[PDB]
């Protein structure tokens, strides 16, 4: 009997089983509705300081594998699921889930009413909680630590996950046949993009590569000046965790590019920064958007896309500046999903595009980058 217990700020207790590391984990608790892709969710920096609850009862049916790691590490504060399968059963699995969580030193709990949880979070919006796995979990302690947690509102999380020193990435997409490809050589990539690592996902990067982009990943705070200095065919503002608001650094920078005719493309957190730098305002969502079945409309084309969402805040459509044209909204809740500068070569998408081998978005970026070099 390896106990575990998760307590919400509100005093709501969930008793179950420990399936990860021994310890405690605290953070904002969210629910993700994805039926597949747990590993990728876990390794997403977007999840920093978050306690992830998965609605799909069986989590771990396929084990884990490096290829399914979206970052160099596990960014989830903790993991809450309903049932941890007896075995992993997939030709690609290299390590069962429990083992993996242990290795990444993650505190996970199993065997609780995830559905009840989810409904809570959905009804009364997000909540900070604490998980305790070990011998005799202390509920009071847990509640304490739960209440004690600062909160993600106004928390710059981007700084905490960004890389230390810039770097190049010339790696493209995975294939069933090829797996993860070898890194491309510089003379192999037409364009040269500079990516602001606001806690970006490996997929996106491979995607840009896929499109001829040789990339230089830079830390969060890097100065436009410093950036502009590399003569970049374009600039890309990756996805990332936390509140965008407090990232004065990047905002400043952004605006700087905005005076330039350089193409700028933002995804998720970067979509919020662009917004900000464009004058608009960001709000923190009741529970957010976490899952992979989210309908998003491209108002311009009147076509719906089924997307992947992993956001805690949003950009207020009321407070938009006229230099900001709405490009996409959420079909689930009307929220703003994308924008473009009426006046500049800059636009962004809230969701998280994915490879077939989004594309429209991505492609645009390129055509934009071309138009720009064709100048």
């Amino acid at each position: 009997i390896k106990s575990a217990l998760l307590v919400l700020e509100d005093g709501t207790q969930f008793h179950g089983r420990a399936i990860g590391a021994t310890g405690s984990a605290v953070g904002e608790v969210v629910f993700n509705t994805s039926m597949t892709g747990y590993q990728e969710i876990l390794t997403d920096p977007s999840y920093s300081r978050q306690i992830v609850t998965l609605t799909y009862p069986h989590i771990g049916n396929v084990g884990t594998n490096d290829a399914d790691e979206e970052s160099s590490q596990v960014h989830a504060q903790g993991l809450v699921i309903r049932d941890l399968p007896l075995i992993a059963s997939n030709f690609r699995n290299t390590e069962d889930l429990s083992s993996y969580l242990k290795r990444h030193n993650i505190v996970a709990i199993a065997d609780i009413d995830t559905r009840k949880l989810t409904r809570l979070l959905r009804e009364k919006g997000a909540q900070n909680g604490c998980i305790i796995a070990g011998d005799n979990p202390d509920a009071a302690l847990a509640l304490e630590k739960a209440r004690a947690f600062p909160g993600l509102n106004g928390m710059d999380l981007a700084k905490e996950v960004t890389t230390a020193e810039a770097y190049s990435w010339t790696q493209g997409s995975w294939t069933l046949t090829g797996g993860l490809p070898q890194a491309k050589k510089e003379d192999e990539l037409p364009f040269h993009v500079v990516a602001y690592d606001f806690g970006a996902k490996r997929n996106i990067l491979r995607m840009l590569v896929d499109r001829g982009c040789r990339l230089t990943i830079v830390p969060a705070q890097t100065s436009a000046e410093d950036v502009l200095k590399m003569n970049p065919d374009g600039i890309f503002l990756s996805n990332g965790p936390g509140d965008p608001a407090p990232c004065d650094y990047a905002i400043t920078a952004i605006q700087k590019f905005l005076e330039t005719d350089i193409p700028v493309f933002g995804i998720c957190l970067g979509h919020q920064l662009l917004a900000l730098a464009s004058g608009a305002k960001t709000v923190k969502m009741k529970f957010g958007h976490h899952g992979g079945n989210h309908p998003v409309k491209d108002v311009e084309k009147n076509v719906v896309m089924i997307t992947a969402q992993n956001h805690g805040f949003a950009v207020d459509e009321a407070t938009l500046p006229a230099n900001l044209r709405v490009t996409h909204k959420s079909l689930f809740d009307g929220t703003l999903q994308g924008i473009h500068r009426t006046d500049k070569p800059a636009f962004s998408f809230q969701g998280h595009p994915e490879a077939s081998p989004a594309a429209p978005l991505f492609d645009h970026f390129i055509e934009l980058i071309e138009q720009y070099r064709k100048t």
């Binding site: 994805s34 609605t55 396929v62 075995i87 030709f91 069933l176 409309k297």
Partner: protein, 1059 residues
């Protein structure tokens, strides 16, 4: 784009009588399509020869046609209704097939009927196997190495090529009809000959084996704007090599990585784009090599199907409804999501927080000689579904809900049988209907997961789970009831163990486990289905039970509730008919103002459509499960008389437990259901019953048998007719009640209602086939076509006497046999019978709605339904038998029911109704040719007339030895034909060569039967119409004088003729 306006009227093509591979799902889908369109202001016209459908209820549509689903007939319908469009994707392959014929006959052109949902070309592109295979390659998706064959020589050449075993799939068929797995040349010629003949396009696709790979399906919907969604993913439990319909399957997929899932999801979409499905749903099937994720596209079905119904139930996303709207120009983004209180659009991909399990239902025990191994051709007769929070929970609930007497993994073999390991092994290697149970036995017998995997190819992910259940069962057995502490019991309940299974384990009574649960306060909670993993609230109460913390039932404290117990999965003898009644009970009482609660777990039914009731509990219909509901709902009344045998059997127990059972008491039900109790009542009532005896021992019987008098009906405590002493014994060996067999008697069914004050005769149906041929397999007429009024009045009176005596409150059914101007009682069924739907359709009175009211307290007088209705037209009911699914079976009628479904024929005369009924039953009868006559002794007299009637109609005759002698003496000289042993050429030869267009063959006597088997089997194999009863043959004769395509009439119109 919103709704189309160049379309006002739409013709919906129904699926026809229920058969293996094409069942209820289409009444569910069909009703949904009506509902949908009707809600969008279209004028709806539909055709369906099957009366037991909700879809054909007059109140569901504008113009309802219960007529043979023949292109000519439909033509008449088109010509008479002038539909602007035709929706052919909601009626199985019948509908696809018909749409295309219509189109091929230029009927559609001639009348300006536009085909919606799916174009003819798209349908063909998917249904023509060769085209389909060309599309995939065009799209760069992979398929099994294969060849198309139009002939046997071609077939053999493909076979040389792909090797054995190979898979055979005909074009334009489904449910594996006409296909199979060939492990050798012999098998190969047999299946190929069969599919080439069954294929509407006389074409086969022959593939190399992928037996053992994983099997997956995806449900897709795509709008005109090109929006596209996966409604559901399905991972099959049973590997490739066993048809999806005969496999245990789960939603959603379980063992694919996100990456493989996406690749599969991309493929699915591409498949629809290439085929051309632009405004509807489709099911895409794939195969996956567990060793390397290699993906192979198998097929696609451009329409609704058994999986989409399953998928719809599984997710709460009403596939067919949505699709019916896309058909009329709507787009996904424009439609609201049904269960989330219209709060979100239909344009999204569902997500679920539970596991759905579906288990097929078989009826092998009704088919003697039948190959009972699972293969690529469907053999199942129904299915059950279950919802659980875990796969374990999910699976066990399905098991217990299967209606096969299981309580979960009950054992099949004995721990101490030295041969078991060997039986197990067999059962595992070559799956049958019981495999699931054998898997558990294997684990009890000491085989490992890997050992089972290897024999079964079932994913270990699943296997380990069953093994863990077994080990838990074993503990239960060790510790016993005393070890059943709260923690442990709770654990067990969480893995879905049933009180009853636990009870057998602990060697106590199910009721004891139940008590223990009460003590501990260990009861399940109810979750709601919502399509979105609880991301959005739902205002629908579509629920399932589970052992968790939070309960979402939130029962109303508000109204007077009525509970309706469903029948579970369909089975032979327990079909759509019962479900129809259930639905009506619900619709009527809801409309009346009660809160209606429905309890059922059959994924294919309208009963399990959340629209049908106020509350739906998608649960196994068992005592445990029901009681838990009752526990919390505290209903005013519970109806147990409408779902068939299933709820019927729970009756006493429920009441014992204090459930408020309404309508005919459980005791009353018993009086009728128990033979003894029953003979006493008859005795009491001074009625007439055949003589009978209960015999223990043999010699006892032989004696008793002398009293009773042969021939006799030998019903144990599988039926049989014994003619003599020798026979008696003879049976005795192979093999109790004993009943004198009423030879040459007319069989009649009577459906009536009793409110304790009066009795309503719903209908008197006269069977065409005599007593001895199960009512469920007999054709019949309303009104009777030969019985005297005198004698019908006698039955009427007995019905009334019996109704009162037995205390019936609601529906009842009476079965009599008429011989020599004397009425004999065969039995009483104090509940809704399978003829109810037909009777309602034929008389315009919704008996189920009426009896339901009675049951709830509204008398017949209060309701204004007190006079028997005798319609001005004839209504004939004919059946459909599954013998073609089991060639090894002798396609012969008898005292045990084997039919899967039925159709209705409406006519000005008996001849006309019969003719329509026969055509509707897919009879290959022709109005000309050569007829073969080979009848039993007794029939030798009446045959002459039959022979003459055939002669008048322009037929030529053949006959075997004895028959010929008789005909000669009467003056008819048929062409003599050889009995196989007699020489050549003989019957088989002739039947085989196409010499006959009709065959009449009657036989009396186990041994005489076994001999003649060959005629019947060839007739069937060769598609020659055949009658096995003299009455039947006469009826067929009468029908020669009619033209089933001459006139059509809508149900509205029929009803309107009733005064």
């Amino acid at each position: 784009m919103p709704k189309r306006t160049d379309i006002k009227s739409i013709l919906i093509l129904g699926a026809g009588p229920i058969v293996i591979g094409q069942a209820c799902e289409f009444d569910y889908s069909g009703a949904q399509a009506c509902k949908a369109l009707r809600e969008e202001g279209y004028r709806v016209i539909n055709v369906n020869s099957n009366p037991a459908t909700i879809m054909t209820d007059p109140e569901m549509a504008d113009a309802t046609y219960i007529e043979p689903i023949h292109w000519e007939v439909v033509r008449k319908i088109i010509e008479k209704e002038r539909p602007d469009a035709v929706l052919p994707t909601m009626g199985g392959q019948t509908a696809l097939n018909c749409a295309l014929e219509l189109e091929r006959q230029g009927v559609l052109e001639e009348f300006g009927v536009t085909m919606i949902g799916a174009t003819a070309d798209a349908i063909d592109k998917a249904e023509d196997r060769r085209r389909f295979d060309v599309a995939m390659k065009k799209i760069g998706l992979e398929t099994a190495r294969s060849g198309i064959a139009h002939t046997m020589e071609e077939a053999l050449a493909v076979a040389a090529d792909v090797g054995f075993p190979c898979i055979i799939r005909p074009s334009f068929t489904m449910g594996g009809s006409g296909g199979g797995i060939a492990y050798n040349r012999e098998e190969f010629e047999e299946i190929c000959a069969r599919g080439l003949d069954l294929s509407p396009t006389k074409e086969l696709l022959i593939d190399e084996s992928l037996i053992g790979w994983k099997e997956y399906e995806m449900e897709v919907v795509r709008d005109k704007n090109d929006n596209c969604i996966i409604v559901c993913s399905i991972e099959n439990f049973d590997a490739m090599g066993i048809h999806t319909g005969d496999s245990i399957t789960v939603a959603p997929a379980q063992t694919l990585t996100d990456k493989e899932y996406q690749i599969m999801r991309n493929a699915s979409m591409a498949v629809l784009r290439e085929i051309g499905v632009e405004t509807g749903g489709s099911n895409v099937q794939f195969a996956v090599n567990p060793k390397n994720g290699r993906l192979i596209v198998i097929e696609m079905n451009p329409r609704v199907s058994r999986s989409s119904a399953l998928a719809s139930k599984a997710t709460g996303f009403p596939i067919a409804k949505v699709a019916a709207k896309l058909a009329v120009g709507y787009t996904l983004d424009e439609l609201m999501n049904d269960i989330t209180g219209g709060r979100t659009p239909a344009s999204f991909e569902p997500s679920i927080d539970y596991v759905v399990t579906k288990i097929p239902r078989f009826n092998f025990e009704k088919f003697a000689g039948a190959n009972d191994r699972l293969t690529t051709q469907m053999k199942s007769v129904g299915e059950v579904m279950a919802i659980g929070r875990t796969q374990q929970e999910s699976l066990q609930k399905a098991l217990r809900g299967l209606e096969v007497g299981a309580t979960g993994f009950d054992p099949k073999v004995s721990l101490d049988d030295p041969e078991a390991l060997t039986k197990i092994r067999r059962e595992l290697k070559d799956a049958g209907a019981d495999r699931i149970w054998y898997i558990a036995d294997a684990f009890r017998a000491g085989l490992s997961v890997d050992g089972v995997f290897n024999l079964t190819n079932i994913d270990r992910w699943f296997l380990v789970q069953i093994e863990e259940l077994v080990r838990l069962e074993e503990k239960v057995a060790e510790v016993g009831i005393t070890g059943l502490n709260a923690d442990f019991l709770r654990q067990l309940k969480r893995k879905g163990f049933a009180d009853a299974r636990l009870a057998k384990l602990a060697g106590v009574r199910e009721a004891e486990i139940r008590k223990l649960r009460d003590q501990y306060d260990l009861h399940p909670v109810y979750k709601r289905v919502d399509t979105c993993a609880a991301e959005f609230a739902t205002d629908t109460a579509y629920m399932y039970s589970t052992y968790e913390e939070e309960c979402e039932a939130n029962p109303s404290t508000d109204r007077e509730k009525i509970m309706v117990l469903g029948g579970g999965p369909n089975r032979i003898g327990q079909g759509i008919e019962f479900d129809y009644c259930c639905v009506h009970a619900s619709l009527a009482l809801r409309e009346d103002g009660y809160e209606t609660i429905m309890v059922n777990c059959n994924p294919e039914t309208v009963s399990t459509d959340y629209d049908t009731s106020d509350r739906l509990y998608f649960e196994p219909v068992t005592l445990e499960d029901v009681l838990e509901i009752v526990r919390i709902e505290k209903p005013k009344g519970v109806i147990v008389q409408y779902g068939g045998q299933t709820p019927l059997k729970l009756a006493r127990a429920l009441e014992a437990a204090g459930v408020p059972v309404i309508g005919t008491s459980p005791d009353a039900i018993d009086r009728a259901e128990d033979r003894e109790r029953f003979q006493h009542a008859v005795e009491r009532l001074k009625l007439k019953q055949p003589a009978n005896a209960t015999v223990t021992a043999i010699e006892m019987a032989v004696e008793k048998a002398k009293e009773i008098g042969y021939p006799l009906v030998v019903r144990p405590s599988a039926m049989e007719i014994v003619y003599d002493e020798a026979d008696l014994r003879r049976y005795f060996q192979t093999a109790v009640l004993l009943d004198h067999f009423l030879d040459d008697a007319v069989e009649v069914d009577v459906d009536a209602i009793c409110d304790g004050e009066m009795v309503l005769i719903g209908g008197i149906m006269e069977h065409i086939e005599q007593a001895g041929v199960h009512s469920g397999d007999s054709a019949c007429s309303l009104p009777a076509y030969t019985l005297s009024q005198e004698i019908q009045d006698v039955m009427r009176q007995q019905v009334q006497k019996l109704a009162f005596e037995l205390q019936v409150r609601g529906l009842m059914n009476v079965q009599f046999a008429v011989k020599n101007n004397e009425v004999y009682l065969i039995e009483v069924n104090p509940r809704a019978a399978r003829t109810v739907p037909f009777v309602s359709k034929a008389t315009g009175v919704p008996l189920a709605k009426v009896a339901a009211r009675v049951m709830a307290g509204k008398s017949l007088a209060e309701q204004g339904v007190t006079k028997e209705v005798i319609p001005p037209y004839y209504s004939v009911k004919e059946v459909v038998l599954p013998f073609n699914k089991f060639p090894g079976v002798d396609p012969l009628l008898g005292p045990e029911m084997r039919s899967t479904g039925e159709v209705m024929g409406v006519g000005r005369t008996f001849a006309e109704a019969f003719a329509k009924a026969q055509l509707g039953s897919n009879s290959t009868m022709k109005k000309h040719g050569r007829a073969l006559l080979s009848v039993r002794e007794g029939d030798k007299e009446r045959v002459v007339d039959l022979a003459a009637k055939l002669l008048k109609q322009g037929f030529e005759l053949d006959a075997t030895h004895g028959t010929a002698i008789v005909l000669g003496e009467a003056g008819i000289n048929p062409r003599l034909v050889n009995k196989v042993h007699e020489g050549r050429p003989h019957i088989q030869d002739r039947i085989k060569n196409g010499e006959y267009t009709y065959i009449i063959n009657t036989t009396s006597g186990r041994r005489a039967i076994e001999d003649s088997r060959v005629i019947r089997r060839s007739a069937l194999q060769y598609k020659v119409h055949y009658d096995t009863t003299l009455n039947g043959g006469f009826a067929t004769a009468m029908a020669l004088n009619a033209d089933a395509t001459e006139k059509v009439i809508s149900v509205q119109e029929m009803h309107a003729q009733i005064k």
